[PDB]
Design a protein around this ligand. Structure first.
Ligand SMILES: *CC(=O)N1Cc2ccccc2C[C@H]1C(=O)NNC(C)=O
Ligand SMILES: *CC(=O)N1Cc2ccccc2C[C@H]1C(=O)NNC(C)=O
Lengths: 304, 304
């Protein structure tokens, strides 16, 4: 028993981290097979970031201008190309530590682990969620750019995120591993306000099921609701509308606990309308939305 | 910017995890150099756990009764001994993945990362604290025993915890890597109530400094206090008494932010007396005590 915000074991990703330097700019790269992936803004100086023309900037760069260091060993760059907002540096050596991997573009509301790195060196790992507004609330200081987000299924690492920037509000924006930004963000030092950060309703319900499984049951009530009645409450509290797809993925948790999804919705409805009344659920005094139904099942069963 | 409950990169520990089986009991082992460390209750059946005589049970065991598997490869056990509550299985092969390491017995209030494992396979990593009552609030299911806690300083892993059991309250107890339990707990299936779980005051203050650094400043007030006045409040709210040693370790955070430690104590005092009033600090609606002053400095500076 016990429920924690758990990240995936980061070992498979640590072996892929490298340092990429171009001119006086240094950031993190991801070395998989004979390619190093990094944010294209490695070619920029601070002055260039105000309004960069990446195609024009990249013309003045050759393979020898990209310095790729894997710990203490230097990689020989034999090719370079830009794919959306990422640079792909072809190297002459395949990473011997390359795990089985995929590149995936995740949906908002999905969770993943971030291996925060500085100068190609891992500093920490944490679990977070792609917010419905396509930002992430991470922990990234200068030099962390190029750090990646991922999920792991037994031996396969699905890379889903590469950190590119911090909005003036302190929230984070980045791309998938094809270099396409999540959300409307551009890799330019210009104020880009993020949209409304709604709560991921299906995740809060999954976490409420995790709480019942682990003994925190005070919030269970004698009520039920309907999808449309619950969504009237969800809209008022800036929660994402719940759909039958969300109810379906909560099915295994509803079966294990014996609590119907709409009954759990009525508990959530009352929690939204009345608050916690000074109480806690799984060590939290607010409704947690960074655990997906898959994460709850995985943790509550011990999947390795 | 941003502040997250970050765990250390787990790679160095993943390479040490093995599966240890004795009879019909299977748990996790830690393979460092030519020794595998695991909880001594691997020699017990469920029936033995009610009142085990480990010395008498271990007499009926030989080296060939301990099955040690590192992924898919089997290790040859050439020696076995009991040191307090851990078994040390000498194997004929040194772990090629053994990182630089130390064994440390941590103090209550200190934090560490746990690599939750099942059958020798890592499932997740999370950061937690050794509570003042010598329990940890982890996430451990059946088969997770032998999972370890650690800290990392650049290339050196300091192992500090090995999971042994769950109290009937759902909190967790374990040993240092010399097999000595933290707290008064014994490795026996008998009700062992834990003492009062107090809040780690120095950690809450460190987290309040992390919040100010990251822009959450609403809780700063126009007041100050004294160590004795603050401790009257700390005692009423089951917070650990603050000492000049605690003030001293908060010195770098007080210097960086310009907020005197006693002024931050007066903010904490008002938060204890008035609550959060429906507000949040670093995404939390309660006062977080699982970040040490060292963790806050490390994260707020980017130590790898
Ligand atoms: C790596 C990083 O932190 N960056 C890269 C980048 C990309 C796009 C626009 C601006 C920058 C600069 C920097 C930041 O995101 N830093 N803070 C800002 C611009 O708010
Ligand atoms: C590994 C494990 O979960 N254990 C080992 C152990 C050690 C000491 C006493 C009892 C047991 C059984 C088991 C538990 O801790 N499980 N739950 C209990 C006993 O509450």
């Amino acid at each position: 028993s016990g429920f924690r915000k758990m990240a995936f074991p980061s070992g498979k990703v640590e072996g892929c981290m490298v340092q990429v330097t171009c001119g006086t700019t240094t950031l993190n790269g991801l070395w998989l097979d004979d390619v190093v992936y990094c944010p294209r803004h490695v070619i920029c100086t601070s002055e260039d970031m105000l309004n960069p023309n990446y195609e024009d900037l990249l013309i003045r760069k050759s393979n020898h201008n990209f310095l790729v260091q894997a710990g203490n060993v230097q990689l020989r760059v034999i090719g370079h190309s830009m794919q959306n907002c990422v640079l792909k540096l072809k190297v002459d050596t395949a990473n011997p530590k390359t795990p089985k991997y995929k590149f995936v573009r995740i949906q908002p509301g999905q969770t993943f682990s971030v291996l925060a790195c500085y100068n190609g060196s891992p500093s920490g790992v944490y679990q977070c969620a792609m917010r419905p507004n396509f930002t992430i609330k991470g922990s990234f200081l200068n030099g962390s750019c190029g750090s990646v987000g991922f999920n792991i299924d037994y031996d396969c690492v699905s890379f889903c995120y590469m950190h590119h920037m911090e909005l003036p509000t302190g929230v984070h924006a980045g791309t998938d591993l094809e270099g396409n930004f999540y959300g409307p963000f551009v890799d330019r030092q210009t104020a880009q306000a993020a949209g409304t950060d709604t709560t991921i309703t299906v995740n809060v319900l999954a976490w409420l099921y995790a709480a019942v499984i682990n003994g925190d049951r005070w919030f269970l009530n004698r009520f039920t609701t309907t999808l449309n009645d619950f969504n009237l409450v969800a809209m008022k509290y800036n929660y994402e509308p719940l759909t039958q797809d969300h109810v379906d993925i909560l099915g295994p948790l509803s079966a294990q606990t014996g609590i119907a999804v709409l009954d759990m919705c009525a508990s959530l409805k009352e929690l939204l309308q009345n608050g916690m009344n000074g109480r806690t659920i799984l060590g939290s005094a607010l409704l947690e939305d960074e655990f997906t139904p898959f994460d709850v099942v995985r943790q509550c069963s011990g999947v390795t």
